[PDB]
Symmetry: C5
Subunit: 391 residues, 5 copies
């Protein structure tokens, strides 16, 4: 006698004519209204200039083909019908490496005022620019864009639906102890035109994502502590001995092994320059210049050299002080010959005493240069931490 | 004359109207009833904060559009019809990296009471948090979530169908000799609301998965045995010789090679800190401080140094004791000169005898410090094993 | 006037009603009949506890909806119709990492007796347990399983169709010079029941796959030949010199480099323990205990030590024998002083002669221990080869 | 009373007959008109001779089945209908490794003049040849091709639609601070015929893509600065000592480690030869020839050798100058014997004085050879930079 | 008045009955006619015994359901209709790892004689055997196979359509400067039968693909040049000194590092044996036997040894020659004692003179053995190059 409410859906799906743009008047544009929220962001591999994310997407647009009345229809204000039989526009992410593995979920809402609602989960992995000027503290600024690809500015209207102050702080839905944390987003409207008389719609979502170097600080500052340890063990030894040389070549090789461990654990891109690794290579360069000085001291303690201290080295010293600062006859003859050979034997020692005073001064000079270099890098690190603390 | 039972399926599929929400009364919510079991869990790559699993999923929901009578229908209580022609809700896993490669299997059950049954195998690889505070013994706690994505709390009711005590212990179906073993799961009901007047359903499955370090114990405790072997071979040698130095630099390089073998075989994440590797780096730091002490002993056995034992080293010693604890004339002249040169020749030996007593005491002091460090780490390892044995 | 035979297919496809379970009587179960053959097996990556294969699958089941008569139909006993319009059950592989990239091939056979035939190529990559107790000779036992996922034991009957003796030896179709070779398979029937009054069908295919170590034998036995070469070059040298020490530290580092080359070329899993690498680490442990003995001999040739040979070393020796086994006065005074200093100069040599006899005996003792260890490992390797030759 | 404009779409979709080639006259070919723009190019992995890109594609073709009149149709000049119901040709990229993950976007334009418009985003990863003759400055020339795969030259006409001067410079739409930058493209028309009487259409897009070595210059020129540093520290030392040998073997090993760091960070292909790495291997070859010379000098300072300076070394020197350039008797006897033994003791020194003058000249000769080699490589590098600056 | 030609396609698609095997008489088999061409072959990763290719595929088969007349149909001899509405057989590649990412392109040709034409691009990555007996020159022989998977030998006839002499040389369509080049292909027909009374069709395409080692020759022959350089620097040094030992241990470690660089840049499979790397390991084995000889010479220059030259070493020498080839009394007493101690002091030198003549001869003997080994390997390399030049 009395059928169910499903015939009402037949009255919702009698003569719909799917495929046509749903408007009463054609020059009046239809209005879609969109919103986005970020549940949890996945990892950033960052080698391919790429980033991954997984967001929840809300939209609704006025369909105007469907009228419902509250009377005699058993008060079904909200009801779900499949999206494969109704109209849907094309809102797409751009600059993407591939489309995310998203489900279909064919259900959308219909109501009395005609508009159709849609919720969808979608993930996107896309190419975007990141700054690696400072490695442990990264800005990681990016921008996503949505557009009506096949429709124009008088075809589909873009509505953000929400006041930007509560868009600015959306931290109620976020996963704990993640590596990357978000601080604020910024919605704004633009337009891009390729040629004349063709203007298409564009919506953009500005994103600031931030990671803290809680793991990188302990694992990266302690190699600098090891640098200070090898610097202060390169301090108390006399420069004239070769034992510091035989230690420091193995120390340079072990330092290169430990730093290539750190740098292949964390490699960088071909676009940006990590200045921490650049300063590590500068330390390796200053250490091999120090090793050139070291083998100069190794050659300096030899007996045979032709070097000039009078014409120009005195000028360098003055410039430093100005800017920077019968058988008894045979018996006596043979014993005097023994005395002469013994005198030659301890005559060996006087040849190396003149050399030892010069190279120690030049070693202390280049040690002061390296100390000012380490102090300037410490000022640079404190300044970078203060700039990041300014935020 | 008499057709087959397939016309009965025509009576089951005459006027179904697929796509409408099947209810008699609209404000009365439909009830789905769900259950999950885990046949075998796949490997966890754990670098991407991700885990893989493969589970079997059971659900059934009251359709109410289909009535069957036991009389005159040849007693077909249970029969299979394809799922592409009937209604199905949307129950989805969240925080997933991609949807699993699952089959379609278009067959579902219909009965006399109206409800439709569904069995499906599904695998999911999803992002989840893991704790790497202690590397060989891992808690590996996680949580999965199912929800009605497009339906609300008065739309679809979630039913767990099974008493939680027999949910707590489900070990009848599990694969032997796997790396990861499960102990218990915990079903519970929650609700999340983003804004006002919008409350959606949520079901959560708590999972404890556990691996035993049967391979990691033998392969990780034996490097500590090698650490004790190199510690006790660093004990019996006299500190004044350079042979311990020339061995210990090669020993430190070989120890670094063997430990980078262990650590690139098992790397960690950028979020958590493996304290075993941290203690290995602490041992490398104490060994290079020991090497700084070692080259201090190498410089200590030289003849030329200006060090003060009287003003402050005696204060350090007191502080340690308080807190821690004619031709014959020419012949005689020349032979006396030979005696004088020979006296100088064995006068060389007395200059190095004063140094040798001090550095041995400081070496034994820092050896006691390292022994207390190894003993404290042994207490820490036994305490961690006891905490894991508490479970 | 006379149409073609395609109208016969219309008589085969007039009122089929796809989607219903095809039976005359419902409690009588339909019978599927299945068979499998393996054309070529792909590689096993074996790190993820996973294996890949590509097999050919034959099945046929009685449809009973389709009757053909040999009279007046131009003798079409066998004809092909698409499988998208007819019924098909669900026979699935389990414990799979993902479904194989298989084609569709929509053609199946129909005949006079009603049953429908199906041939399909399908590949599967699935998780399965492998034994790595012995690395070059692997058993590689596994089991695959097929089931009716949505049907019960009174719904679909499983038929193997072939006598198990000719299932046991199927080597006519196999690719030559592959790494993995199969020997026999074993078909058997089981049943698994999760809860009461619910019993589902199960078919299992037992598989023995085997690889020969023709590459691993030459590349793995020759490092043991190098171990015997370094053992016999560690034999003829006197232990008192440091030249064997300075060679053996570089030999241990080069041996570690060559063995990490072998072991990162062939790594193992986190579940099983490769005992060949375990014995390699045992050889490294015995070599560093030998190196501790070696530096004990290095300290043994020094002049200053306080060791006790009388109280306990004699007890150790007895235990080894029991279980294991005027101016002329000034001239004469000064020349006698020269004689005294020269007597002291060759008095240096007598202090080191007492030490040299003890450590050679202990070195030969630990060399006998290492020789018995290598001989026991040779017995173990011959025993393992004999156990594999037993098959 | 008055229906909407959707019935007009019914008048657009009444008797379309999708699947037929839309022409009035068959021998008159239909005309497609195409254009391409490059929004942002992705990274080039370049190991697989492959490159990735993401472009925007515009096309339109005359359909001629659809007539619209401006009168009485409410002025709908442009309207969107789905592309799944209308005709579309096959324009495909060739030599592709796989098809890009592109969306469907089922909407195309229809107008009064009959032609249908289509916009699509598509990415393609394809095999193409690149030149690695010079590593930091790469030409990276390539060519893409579009064709009508199933249609012939009298079937589909290809139209580029745009004047080639404004095709030549299209830099208004390009992403900033990318690694690869484009300069110009070149459109042209060709034709390929496999056999006789079969000629098919072809369109080709020539692409010049360019990367700047802003990261590679600083990271690659500074190893050459290190090469000059080790060259000038190999200058001031005397060749006769072994300290330069013991440094230079460790210097060669450290140089090989640093260069294998650079070369496994940036590897090359199996097709092209990177001449910078070739010159690095040439420097390693000249350094091991220098090391052979070095150990020749090491053997040169020994006392026992049989070498001929008279017959042929004088000829080599002339060729170099021409082209390149009672008891007292017992007392006296025994003291004369002491004099004879002391004379033998300082007779040791005269044997090594003759050798030292020759090898220094040959060392300076090969140092001049290496200096001319480094100077020629500097000329080569400046010439290559000038050729790239010519562009 | 006069409709278009699309109604003709309706006359082509009125009563087609898709899904039936199209024949007039059933026992007369339908004939497909196929051809293949290779545009460009992709890279071969060769670790997984796998190869990739991308080919163009041409086929046509007689449909016989469609008749066209040249009269009154406006001369449409060739026209395109979609392939989703017409019959298509199943021609598949076998032994494939996965199906290639191929497009759909739903357009096929129909004509007056009834047959339907099809062109398709398809790529396939498949498992196939390769020979690595000689590494730089590879045969790389393979075979592909096509078959009618679901049809028998009286169902579908295979036609190659082209004379085999012009199949033998098809080099008009091939990409320049690729790594792999093809020389000839060989078409032939076979048949495989699993059981009795079941014989299915098979077509096979034999492929010879060839790569030239233009990069491998320069990068692989120059390590052999380095082997000759280290061999000739191991020639001029005297064997009695330890300086050759201290160089050659570092030379062996550096040679192992350089060769593991070459061998992890180019690794091999677990099936085949690369004899170049085998000869490299043989050179390492002969060098460590040479190092055992070297440390035998190191022990040979010591003063304390008990070796027998008389009983058996003379027999070895004969076998080599046969097959291979008052106070004055106190003064005189004390000065004679000084003479005796001085006589003992230069009595040290005579003990080491007897040893030095033997080990040089044995060193030259093993050097001749290594020279014959290098000469035999040179003969082997020239012979392998001549065998490859025979082709
Ligand atoms: C299809 O082609 C045939 C072959 O040319 C056409 O037959 C001839 O067409 C010419 C062109 O006008 C006439 O002059 C001849 O008289 C035709 N032959 C005969 C026997 O009448 C045929 O007309 C073409 N079909 C159509 C529709 O034009
Ligand atoms: N799981 C319920 C879906 C859901 C809840 N809140 C949401 C907010 C936005 C969105 O796209 C989706 C949602
Ligand atoms: N072959 C059917 C497997 C099976 C048996 N019982 C089950 C229960 C739930 C489920 O998802 C699956 C199953
Ligand atoms: N994003 C809107 C589509 C669009 C704008 N400009 C374009 C240029 C070319 C093209 O294929 C497409 C477009
Ligand atoms: N543009 C069509 C390419 C093409 C030309 N001739 C061909 C022959 C065979 C084939 O598969 C493809 C082709
Ligand atoms: N070309 C058909 C291959 C084939 C021959 N015999 C078979 C038997 C079973 C099977 O799945 C496949 C086959």
């Amino acid at each position: 006698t009395q059928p169910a409410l499903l015939r009402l859906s037949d009255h919702l799906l009698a003569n719909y004519k799917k495929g046509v743009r749903p408007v009463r008047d054609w020059r009046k544009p239809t209005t879609v209204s969109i919103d986005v929220i970020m549940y949890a962001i996945l990892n950033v591999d960052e080698k391919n200039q790429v980033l991954t994310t997984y967001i929840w997407y809300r939209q609704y647009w006025t369909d105007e083909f469907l009228q419902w009345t509250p009377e005699d229809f058993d008060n079904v204000t909200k009801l779900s019908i499949p999206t494969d039989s109704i109209w849907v526009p094309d809102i797409l992410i751009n600059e993407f490496v591939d489309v995310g593995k998203s489900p279909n979920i064919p259900y959308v809402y219909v109501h009395h005022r005609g508009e159709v609602q849609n919720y969808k989960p979608l993930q996107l992995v896309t190419a975007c620019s990141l700054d690696i000027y400072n490695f442990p503290f990264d800005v990681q600024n990016c921008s996503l864009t949505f557009t009506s690809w096949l429709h124009t500015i008088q075809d589909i209207n873009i509505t953000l639906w929400r006041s930007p102050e509560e868009v600015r702080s959306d931290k109620s839905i976020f996963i704990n102890q993640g590596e990357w944390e978000l601080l604020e987003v910024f919605p704004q409207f633009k337009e891009f035109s390729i040629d004349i008389s063709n203007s298409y719609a564009e919506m953009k979502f500005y994103v600031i994502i931030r990671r803290r170097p809680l793991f990188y600080a302990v694992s990266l500052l302690l190699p600098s502590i090891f640098l200070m340890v090898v610097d202060i063990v390169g301090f108390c030894l006399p420069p004239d001995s070769g034992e510091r040389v035989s230690f420091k070549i193995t120390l340079l090789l072990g330092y290169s092994v430990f730093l290539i461990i750190v740098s292949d654990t964390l490699p960088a891109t071909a676009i940006g320059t990590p200045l921490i690794g650049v300063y590590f290579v500068v330390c390796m360069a200053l250490l091999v210049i120090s090793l050139a000085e070291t083998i100069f001291i190794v050659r300096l303690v030899h007996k045979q050299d032709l070097q000039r201290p009078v014409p120009d080295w005195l000028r360098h010293l003055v410039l430093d002080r100005i800017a920077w600062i019968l058988a008894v006859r045979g018996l006596l003859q043979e014993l005097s010959s023994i005395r002469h050979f013994l005198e030659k034997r301890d005559e060996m020692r006087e040849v190396a005493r003149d050399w030892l005073r010069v190279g120690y001064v030049l070693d202390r000079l280049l040690f002061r240069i390296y100390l000012l270099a380490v102090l300037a890098y410490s000022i640079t690190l404190v300044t970078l931490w203060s700039i990041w603390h300014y935020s």
